[PDB]
Amino acid sequence: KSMAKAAGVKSVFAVGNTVYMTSFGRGNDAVLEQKIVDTSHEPLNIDDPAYQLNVVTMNGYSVTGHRGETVSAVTDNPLRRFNGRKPEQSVPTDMLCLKPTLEKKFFGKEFDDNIHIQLIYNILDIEKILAVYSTNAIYALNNMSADENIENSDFFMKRTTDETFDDFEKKKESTNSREKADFDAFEKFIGNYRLAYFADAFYVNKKAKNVLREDKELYSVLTLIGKLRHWCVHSEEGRAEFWLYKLDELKDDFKNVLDVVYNRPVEEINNRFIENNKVNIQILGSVYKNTDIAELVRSYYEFLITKKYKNMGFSIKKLRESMLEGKGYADKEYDSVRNKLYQMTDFILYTGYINEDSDRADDLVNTLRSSLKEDDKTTVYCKEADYLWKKYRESIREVADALDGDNIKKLSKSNIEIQEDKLRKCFISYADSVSEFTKLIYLLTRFLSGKEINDLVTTLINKFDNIRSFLEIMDELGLDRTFTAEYSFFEGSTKYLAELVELNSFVKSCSFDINAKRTMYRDALDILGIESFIASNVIDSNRFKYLVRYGNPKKIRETAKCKPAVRFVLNEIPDAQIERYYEACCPCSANKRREKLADMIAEIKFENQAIIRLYLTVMYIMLKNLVNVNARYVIAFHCVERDTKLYAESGLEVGNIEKNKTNLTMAVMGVKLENGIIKTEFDKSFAENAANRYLRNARWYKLILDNLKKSERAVVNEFRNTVCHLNAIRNININIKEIKEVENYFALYHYLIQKHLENRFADKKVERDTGDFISKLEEHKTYCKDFVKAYCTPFGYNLVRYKNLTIDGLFDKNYPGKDDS
RNA sequence: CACCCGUGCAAAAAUGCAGGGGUCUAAAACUGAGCGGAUAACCUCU
RNA sequence: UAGAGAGGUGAUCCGCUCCA
Ligand SMILES: [Mg+2]
């Protein structure tokens, strides 16, 4: 987008009165080129200048890079920020005017630079991205007890990693009713039949059958996630602030359960790596009659699992496809062992390429990089494939004829006695040499879907890589960086980055218990509305697996009867897919086809039936999107809970936060609540004394003040409780009963929230504005665009977040829209 | 097609044109060759 | 016609490596 980024300007920093500029290095690193003080620059990195300064002035800098095509761009001097037309230049502050307090929190003192603030913001992003997935996981585990649904202070809410299971059992005989209820809730949870849906966490094999873990292990696994959620979404006090970063100091039981949970996939991958692929290696060694067997298994492990030496610069799969084309191996007879044949051929190609065919690989990579046209690309691929086939014709023939039918049985029954000394060097690390943070993260992802698992892992690696790059460039300048005593967890950022990269290689979705199949047939029976085939068809479906985890089957069955909701969601379906779906089971235009398909979906009944796939697909996508929309407000509430304490440390009289969470935006504005109402009216003088730069502008200050008078503490409290507990989705079958016409997922989610709020506040007196909002909601049969900004006011101090979270069209990145007024 | 900031030309104190922002939001990076993961769709054999 | 598995293919989102 920006021409400055294209020109190669990575970042612009300002320390003291001197300004440094960085450019992109190898990977995600950084390096200094230009330093400018008092419009006078001295070059650095003489060996390879990414860009050069055409002209220098106090206003800005002129650069022309060589990253790609010669592109000229102009960058702005950060020292002149906030000091325009308004001794008149200084290091820029934070938009929230909360920089010195954060710098004092994570470091000894203020550093008067603009790098540490970026590092702190990147650190905060870790908690910000952990909150959403932690609350999603805790919702997934809380989905149990669906039949006897109740809403109160839940068992998972009050879980802390202070008392072990030894002390927890003491509540069994205690006369205290409050603790008796908690212990009974835990006992009821431990006997739930649906626990098998997370067999990768609560189940362990025992000589062999999968069996339920011991009680203390289960309690530890539950309470770890519970405490993680409570710490990340709430605000701690005392020594519990630094729980995640002083994770090294738990009790023994949690360490043991983390070790046993994380070790099982490693044992299944590494310990029996020989046995799983024995039929392949035993013939590969025959093919390589003059190589070391230990080196061969080492190379096979490197290729198949870690892919450490892969990515040489061409698709080996395409090379194999072009090499085998036109030969007899495409025939149907070899289809039984076809996958093993491709694996052997690919490994042979790789091994030949890494050892001897190095110059050829380099030439192929250079030729691929030098050209752009696809015709030349495929011609070069075929040219290399012909030579490769000519060289390797005999070996693949040897592999193919040695992998026929009963010969595999003879291969399997025989034993093998390889030496494991050379192989263990490249083994992935066991649980004995793995940090607690990665173990806890892995335990967290046992309750997430594939998309969520990938997003979490990738964002974590990206953030840690950014932290490492900032640490390195901080080292380059020569300033102090050493963290405080209680925040030393980030000192070894490189170790955690490499560890997470290793973890990402083998992380997979949680496997499902074999014995749970009986429960599947009854649950899938109810999700199709067949009350007192399907098991063979839809149980294995991934949509069913990701729908049963995050939703009550009965509520999902009931919520599909709402015709407009189903009608809207299938609009995003590509034309070809729905066109195929329609004529598949129905026996003139796209819109009527969609409407008829939605009507057929709504009235699904039983007593050619390929319609089931579309129903599960649409249920899965709409539920996932509704969950994702709610995830944003969890982030906002977590940010509020952090910012109230940060501002209190800053010196502002924020006051109590839990009783009324509008206190944050009230303290920033300089207005104080009096006798239940905001007495003061708007005045321009109040804008100049805003606690942060966001509320300095008069118009948005007045808008926030006007909207604040229509907010109520009880409504905001209930909205907060609904957001954290996800009660809007948990009671979808009632809150979506009488919708008329939805226009986007934002509107659907907010209508759900409105209906929930109206349902609960039906028997309590309320002030006039809320009554007017309720009257508007019921008559229009759609979400009100004023209540949405009325109860979203606690995030008012962050004006940008306010606008994004209350204006339809500014909320979704993929669906831009117009702005009001 | 949101927010903030700088510069040059208009001032009636507020607009236009042209740029930057990991220190704004779920939110910093153009092209080419590849790796991994996740959800799909199509074809061929059983 | 609708119901198993394997292989391949045109498209999507996130991360990562190399060169310009
Ligand atoms: Mg940021």
PDB file of N, CA and C in Angstrom, chain A residues 526-593:
ATOM      1  N   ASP A 526     -30.725 -36.632  17.462  1.00  0.00           N
ATOM      2  CA  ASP A 526     -31.476 -35.465  17.909  1.00  0.00           C
ATOM      3  C   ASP A 526     -31.185 -34.230  17.067  1.00  0.00           C
ATOM      4  N   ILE A 527     -29.952 -34.080  16.575  1.00  0.00           N
ATOM      5  CA  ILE A 527     -29.619 -32.914  15.766  1.00  0.00           C
ATOM      6  C   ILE A 527     -30.338 -32.934  14.425  1.00  0.00           C
ATOM      7  N   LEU A 528     -30.886 -34.077  14.025  1.00  0.00           N
ATOM      8  CA  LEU A 528     -31.672 -34.179  12.805  1.00  0.00           C
ATOM      9  C   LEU A 528     -33.170 -34.169  13.066  1.00  0.00           C
ATOM     10  N   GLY A 529     -33.591 -33.972  14.312  1.00  0.00           N
ATOM     11  CA  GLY A 529     -35.004 -33.879  14.611  1.00  0.00           C
ATOM     12  C   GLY A 529     -35.771 -35.175  14.500  1.00  0.00           C
ATOM     13  N   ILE A 530     -35.094 -36.314  14.586  1.00  0.00           N
ATOM     14  CA  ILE A 530     -35.744 -37.619  14.499  1.00  0.00           C
ATOM     15  C   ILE A 530     -35.896 -38.123  15.930  1.00  0.00           C
ATOM     16  N   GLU A 531     -37.056 -37.858  16.518  1.00  0.00           N
ATOM     17  CA  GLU A 531     -37.348 -38.274  17.880  1.00  0.00           C
ATOM     18  C   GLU A 531     -38.121 -39.590  17.890  1.00  0.00           C
ATOM     19  N   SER A 532     -38.041 -40.287  19.019  1.00  0.00           N
ATOM     20  CA  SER A 532     -38.741 -41.555  19.188  1.00  0.00           C
ATOM     21  C   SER A 532     -40.219 -41.328  19.483  1.00  0.00           C
ATOM     22  N   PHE A 533     -26.866 -45.914   8.907  1.00  0.00           N
ATOM     23  CA  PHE A 533     -27.230 -44.865   7.965  1.00  0.00           C
ATOM     24  C   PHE A 533     -26.577 -43.553   8.361  1.00  0.00           C
ATOM     25  N   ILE A 534     -27.261 -42.830   9.249  1.00  0.00           N
ATOM     26  CA  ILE A 534     -26.755 -41.551   9.734  1.00  0.00           C
ATOM     27  C   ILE A 534     -25.415 -41.737  10.433  1.00  0.00           C
ATOM     28  N   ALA A 535     -25.299 -42.785  11.253  1.00  0.00           N
ATOM     29  CA  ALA A 535     -24.045 -43.050  11.949  1.00  0.00           C
ATOM     30  C   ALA A 535     -22.918 -43.340  10.967  1.00  0.00           C
ATOM     31  N   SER A 536     -23.206 -44.103   9.914  1.00  0.00           N
ATOM     32  CA  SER A 536     -22.188 -44.411   8.920  1.00  0.00           C
ATOM     33  C   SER A 536     -21.866 -43.228   8.019  1.00  0.00           C
ATOM     34  N   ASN A 537     -22.750 -42.234   7.940  1.00  0.00           N
ATOM     35  CA  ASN A 537     -22.577 -41.138   6.994  1.00  0.00           C
ATOM     36  C   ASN A 537     -21.995 -39.875   7.621  1.00  0.00           C
ATOM     37  N   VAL A 538     -22.646 -39.316   8.641  1.00  0.00           N
ATOM     38  CA  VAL A 538     -22.321 -37.967   9.099  1.00  0.00           C
ATOM     39  C   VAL A 538     -21.526 -37.936  10.394  1.00  0.00           C
ATOM     40  N   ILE A 539     -21.348 -39.070  11.074  1.00  0.00           N
ATOM     41  CA  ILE A 539     -20.563 -39.068  12.306  1.00  0.00           C
ATOM     42  C   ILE A 539     -19.118 -38.684  12.019  1.00  0.00           C
ATOM     43  N   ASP A 540     -18.538 -39.250  10.961  1.00  0.00           N
ATOM     44  CA  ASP A 540     -17.157 -38.957  10.604  1.00  0.00           C
ATOM     45  C   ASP A 540     -16.970 -37.551  10.051  1.00  0.00           C
ATOM     46  N   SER A 541     -18.052 -36.841   9.743  1.00  0.00           N
ATOM     47  CA  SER A 541     -17.934 -35.524   9.133  1.00  0.00           C
ATOM     48  C   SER A 541     -17.266 -34.541  10.084  1.00  0.00           C
ATOM     49  N   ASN A 542     -16.360 -33.729   9.536  1.00  0.00           N
ATOM     50  CA  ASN A 542     -15.683 -32.718  10.340  1.00  0.00           C
ATOM     51  C   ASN A 542     -16.646 -31.632  10.806  1.00  0.00           C
ATOM     52  N   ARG A 543     -17.660 -31.316   9.996  1.00  0.00           N
ATOM     53  CA  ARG A 543     -18.658 -30.336  10.410  1.00  0.00           C
ATOM     54  C   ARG A 543     -19.381 -30.794  11.667  1.00  0.00           C
ATOM     55  N   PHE A 544     -19.758 -32.071  11.723  1.00  0.00           N
ATOM     56  CA  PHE A 544     -20.402 -32.594  12.922  1.00  0.00           C
ATOM     57  C   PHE A 544     -19.467 -32.521  14.119  1.00  0.00           C
ATOM     58  N   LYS A 545     -18.184 -32.821  13.910  1.00  0.00           N
ATOM     59  CA  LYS A 545     -17.229 -32.791  15.012  1.00  0.00           C
ATOM     60  C   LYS A 545     -17.065 -31.381  15.564  1.00  0.00           C
ATOM     61  N   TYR A 546     -17.017 -30.378  14.688  1.00  0.00           N
ATOM     62  CA  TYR A 546     -16.874 -29.004  15.157  1.00  0.00           C
ATOM     63  C   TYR A 546     -18.200 -28.367  15.550  1.00  0.00           C
ATOM     64  N   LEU A 547     -19.323 -29.036  15.301  1.00  0.00           N
ATOM     65  CA  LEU A 547     -20.616 -28.526  15.736  1.00  0.00           C
ATOM     66  C   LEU A 547     -21.042 -29.099  17.081  1.00  0.00           C
ATOM     67  N   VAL A 548     -20.771 -30.384  17.322  1.00  0.00           N
ATOM     68  CA  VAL A 548     -21.165 -30.999  18.585  1.00  0.00           C
ATOM     69  C   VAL A 548     -20.340 -30.443  19.740  1.00  0.00           C
ATOM     70  N   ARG A 549     -19.107 -30.013  19.472  1.00  0.00           N
ATOM     71  CA  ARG A 549     -18.262 -29.475  20.532  1.00  0.00           C
ATOM     72  C   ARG A 549     -18.806 -28.152  21.057  1.00  0.00           C
ATOM     73  N   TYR A 550     -19.203 -27.256  20.156  1.00  0.00           N
ATOM     74  CA  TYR A 550     -19.515 -25.878  20.507  1.00  0.00           C
ATOM     75  C   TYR A 550     -21.008 -25.589  20.579  1.00  0.00           C
ATOM     76  N   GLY A 551     -21.860 -26.596  20.478  1.00  0.00           N
ATOM     77  CA  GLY A 551     -23.292 -26.348  20.477  1.00  0.00           C
ATOM     78  C   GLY A 551     -24.079 -27.518  21.016  1.00  0.00           C
ATOM     79  N   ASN A 552     -25.196 -27.201  21.656  1.00  0.00           N
ATOM     80  CA  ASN A 552     -26.147 -28.218  22.079  1.00  0.00           C
ATOM     81  C   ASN A 552     -26.872 -28.748  20.850  1.00  0.00           C
ATOM     82  N   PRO A 553     -26.875 -30.062  20.609  1.00  0.00           N
ATOM     83  CA  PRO A 553     -27.564 -30.578  19.415  1.00  0.00           C
ATOM     84  C   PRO A 553     -29.033 -30.197  19.340  1.00  0.00           C
ATOM     85  N   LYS A 554     -29.746 -30.213  20.468  1.00  0.00           N
ATOM     86  CA  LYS A 554     -31.158 -29.847  20.447  1.00  0.00           C
ATOM     87  C   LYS A 554     -31.346 -28.380  20.079  1.00  0.00           C
ATOM     88  N   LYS A 555     -30.547 -27.495  20.677  1.00  0.00           N
ATOM     89  CA  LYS A 555     -30.662 -26.073  20.378  1.00  0.00           C
ATOM     90  C   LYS A 555     -30.287 -25.784  18.931  1.00  0.00           C
ATOM     91  N   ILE A 556     -29.282 -26.488  18.408  1.00  0.00           N
ATOM     92  CA  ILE A 556     -28.923 -26.336  17.002  1.00  0.00           C
ATOM     93  C   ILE A 556     -30.070 -26.789  16.112  1.00  0.00           C
ATOM     94  N   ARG A 557     -30.718 -27.898  16.472  1.00  0.00           N
ATOM     95  CA  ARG A 557     -31.853 -28.375  15.690  1.00  0.00           C
ATOM     96  C   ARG A 557     -32.991 -27.364  15.694  1.00  0.00           C
ATOM     97  N   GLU A 558     -33.261 -26.752  16.847  1.00  0.00           N
ATOM     98  CA  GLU A 558     -34.372 -25.808  16.927  1.00  0.00           C
ATOM     99  C   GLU A 558     -34.049 -24.497  16.220  1.00  0.00           C
ATOM    100  N   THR A 559     -32.799 -24.040  16.307  1.00  0.00           N
ATOM    101  CA  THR A 559     -32.441 -22.737  15.760  1.00  0.00           C
ATOM    102  C   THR A 559     -32.385 -22.722  14.239  1.00  0.00           C
ATOM    103  N   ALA A 560     -32.365 -23.884  13.588  1.00  0.00           N
ATOM    104  CA  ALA A 560     -32.394 -23.924  12.134  1.00  0.00           C
ATOM    105  C   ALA A 560     -33.788 -23.698  11.569  1.00  0.00           C
ATOM    106  N   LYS A 561     -34.818 -23.694  12.416  1.00  0.00           N
ATOM    107  CA  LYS A 561     -36.172 -23.448  11.942  1.00  0.00           C
ATOM    108  C   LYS A 561     -36.401 -21.986  11.586  1.00  0.00           C
ATOM    109  N   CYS A 562     -35.561 -21.079  12.079  1.00  0.00           N
ATOM    110  CA  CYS A 562     -35.690 -19.663  11.752  1.00  0.00           C
ATOM    111  C   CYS A 562     -35.293 -19.449  10.297  1.00  0.00           C
ATOM    112  N   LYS A 563     -36.287 -19.239   9.436  1.00  0.00           N
ATOM    113  CA  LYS A 563     -36.030 -19.186   7.998  1.00  0.00           C
ATOM    114  C   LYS A 563     -35.103 -18.051   7.581  1.00  0.00           C
ATOM    115  N   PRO A 564     -35.302 -16.794   8.004  1.00  0.00           N
ATOM    116  CA  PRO A 564     -34.397 -15.732   7.526  1.00  0.00           C
ATOM    117  C   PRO A 564     -32.944 -15.944   7.910  1.00  0.00           C
ATOM    118  N   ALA A 565     -32.683 -16.504   9.093  1.00  0.00           N
ATOM    119  CA  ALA A 565     -31.303 -16.737   9.504  1.00  0.00           C
ATOM    120  C   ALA A 565     -30.609 -17.714   8.566  1.00  0.00           C
ATOM    121  N   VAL A 566     -31.285 -18.809   8.217  1.00  0.00           N
ATOM    122  CA  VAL A 566     -30.716 -19.763   7.271  1.00  0.00           C
ATOM    123  C   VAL A 566     -30.612 -19.139   5.886  1.00  0.00           C
ATOM    124  N   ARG A 567     -31.584 -18.302   5.521  1.00  0.00           N
ATOM    125  CA  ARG A 567     -31.575 -17.682   4.201  1.00  0.00           C
ATOM    126  C   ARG A 567     -30.364 -16.780   4.020  1.00  0.00           C
ATOM    127  N   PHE A 568     -30.010 -16.013   5.051  1.00  0.00           N
ATOM    128  CA  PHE A 568     -28.912 -15.064   4.904  1.00  0.00           C
ATOM    129  C   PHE A 568     -27.569 -15.772   4.771  1.00  0.00           C
ATOM    130  N   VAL A 569     -27.334 -16.801   5.586  1.00  0.00           N
ATOM    131  CA  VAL A 569     -25.993 -17.371   5.682  1.00  0.00           C
ATOM    132  C   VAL A 569     -25.603 -18.078   4.388  1.00  0.00           C
ATOM    133  N   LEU A 570     -26.552 -18.750   3.737  1.00  0.00           N
ATOM    134  CA  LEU A 570     -26.203 -19.446   2.502  1.00  0.00           C
ATOM    135  C   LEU A 570     -25.968 -18.501   1.331  1.00  0.00           C
ATOM    136  N   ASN A 571     -26.126 -17.189   1.519  1.00  0.00           N
ATOM    137  CA  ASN A 571     -25.799 -16.249   0.453  1.00  0.00           C
ATOM    138  C   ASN A 571     -24.311 -16.275   0.133  1.00  0.00           C
ATOM    139  N   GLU A 572     -23.467 -16.399   1.160  1.00  0.00           N
ATOM    140  CA  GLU A 572     -22.024 -16.424   0.951  1.00  0.00           C
ATOM    141  C   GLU A 572     -21.565 -17.662   0.192  1.00  0.00           C
ATOM    142  N   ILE A 573     -22.397 -18.697   0.118  1.00  0.00           N
ATOM    143  CA  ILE A 573     -22.016 -19.932  -0.577  1.00  0.00           C
ATOM    144  C   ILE A 573     -21.731 -19.622  -2.042  1.00  0.00           C
ATOM    145  N   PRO A 574     -20.625 -20.105  -2.608  1.00  0.00           N
ATOM    146  CA  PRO A 574     -20.342 -19.832  -4.021  1.00  0.00           C
ATOM    147  C   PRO A 574     -21.407 -20.432  -4.925  1.00  0.00           C
ATOM    148  N   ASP A 575     -21.589 -19.802  -6.088  1.00  0.00           N
ATOM    149  CA  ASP A 575     -22.695 -20.162  -6.970  1.00  0.00           C
ATOM    150  C   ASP A 575     -22.614 -21.617  -7.414  1.00  0.00           C
ATOM    151  N   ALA A 576     -21.413 -22.091  -7.750  1.00  0.00           N
ATOM    152  CA  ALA A 576     -21.272 -23.454  -8.252  1.00  0.00           C
ATOM    153  C   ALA A 576     -21.703 -24.481  -7.212  1.00  0.00           C
ATOM    154  N   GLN A 577     -21.313 -24.279  -5.952  1.00  0.00           N
ATOM    155  CA  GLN A 577     -21.622 -25.257  -4.915  1.00  0.00           C
ATOM    156  C   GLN A 577     -23.125 -25.387  -4.705  1.00  0.00           C
ATOM    157  N   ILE A 578     -23.825 -24.257  -4.583  1.00  0.00           N
ATOM    158  CA  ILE A 578     -25.263 -24.324  -4.347  1.00  0.00           C
ATOM    159  C   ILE A 578     -25.988 -24.808  -5.596  1.00  0.00           C
ATOM    160  N   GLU A 579     -25.496 -24.443  -6.782  1.00  0.00           N
ATOM    161  CA  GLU A 579     -26.094 -24.962  -8.007  1.00  0.00           C
ATOM    162  C   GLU A 579     -25.984 -26.479  -8.066  1.00  0.00           C
ATOM    163  N   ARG A 580     -24.834 -27.024  -7.661  1.00  0.00           N
ATOM    164  CA  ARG A 580     -24.697 -28.474  -7.577  1.00  0.00           C
ATOM    165  C   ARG A 580     -25.627 -29.055  -6.520  1.00  0.00           C
ATOM    166  N   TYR A 581     -25.751 -28.378  -5.376  1.00  0.00           N
ATOM    167  CA  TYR A 581     -26.583 -28.891  -4.291  1.00  0.00           C
ATOM    168  C   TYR A 581     -28.048 -28.972  -4.696  1.00  0.00           C
ATOM    169  N   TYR A 582     -28.541 -27.962  -5.414  1.00  0.00           N
ATOM    170  CA  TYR A 582     -29.970 -27.875  -5.697  1.00  0.00           C
ATOM    171  C   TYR A 582     -30.447 -29.066  -6.518  1.00  0.00           C
ATOM    172  N   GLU A 583     -29.927 -29.209  -7.737  1.00  0.00           N
ATOM    173  CA  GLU A 583     -30.345 -30.306  -8.602  1.00  0.00           C
ATOM    174  C   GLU A 583     -29.939 -31.669  -8.057  1.00  0.00           C
ATOM    175  N   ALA A 584     -29.052 -31.714  -7.060  1.00  0.00           N
ATOM    176  CA  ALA A 584     -28.646 -32.993  -6.492  1.00  0.00           C
ATOM    177  C   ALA A 584     -29.819 -33.707  -5.833  1.00  0.00           C
ATOM    178  N   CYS A 585     -30.667 -32.968  -5.118  1.00  0.00           N
ATOM    179  CA  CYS A 585     -31.741 -33.577  -4.342  1.00  0.00           C
ATOM    180  C   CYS A 585     -33.127 -33.009  -4.608  1.00  0.00           C
ATOM    181  N   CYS A 586     -33.248 -31.808  -5.171  1.00  0.00           N
ATOM    182  CA  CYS A 586     -34.575 -31.249  -5.425  1.00  0.00           C
ATOM    183  C   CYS A 586     -35.391 -32.076  -6.411  1.00  0.00           C
ATOM    184  N   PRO A 587     -34.872 -32.472  -7.588  1.00  0.00           N
ATOM    185  CA  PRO A 587     -35.743 -33.243  -8.481  1.00  0.00           C
ATOM    186  C   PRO A 587     -35.910 -34.692  -8.037  1.00  0.00           C
ATOM    187  N   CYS A 588     -35.017 -21.516 -11.331  1.00  0.00           N
ATOM    188  CA  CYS A 588     -34.810 -20.896 -12.634  1.00  0.00           C
ATOM    189  C   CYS A 588     -33.798 -19.759 -12.542  1.00  0.00           C
ATOM    190  N   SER A 589     -33.622 -19.230 -11.333  1.00  0.00           N
ATOM    191  CA  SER A 589     -32.681 -18.149 -11.081  1.00  0.00           C
ATOM    192  C   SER A 589     -31.987 -18.400  -9.750  1.00  0.00           C
ATOM    193  N   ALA A 590     -30.889 -17.675  -9.528  1.00  0.00           N
ATOM    194  CA  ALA A 590     -30.085 -17.901  -8.330  1.00  0.00           C
ATOM    195  C   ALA A 590     -30.863 -17.583  -7.058  1.00  0.00           C
ATOM    196  N   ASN A 591     -31.578 -16.456  -7.038  1.00  0.00           N
ATOM    197  CA  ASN A 591     -32.236 -16.018  -5.810  1.00  0.00           C
ATOM    198  C   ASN A 591     -33.380 -16.950  -5.424  1.00  0.00           C
ATOM    199  N   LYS A 592     -34.227 -17.311  -6.391  1.00  0.00           N
ATOM    200  CA  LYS A 592     -35.307 -18.245  -6.097  1.00  0.00           C
ATOM    201  C   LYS A 592     -34.765 -19.615  -5.718  1.00  0.00           C
ATOM    202  N   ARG A 593     -33.652 -20.026  -6.329  1.00  0.00           N
ATOM    203  CA  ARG A 593     -33.010 -21.276  -5.938  1.00  0.00           C
ATOM    204  C   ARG A 593     -32.570 -21.225  -4.481  1.00  0.00           C
TER     205      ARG A 593
END
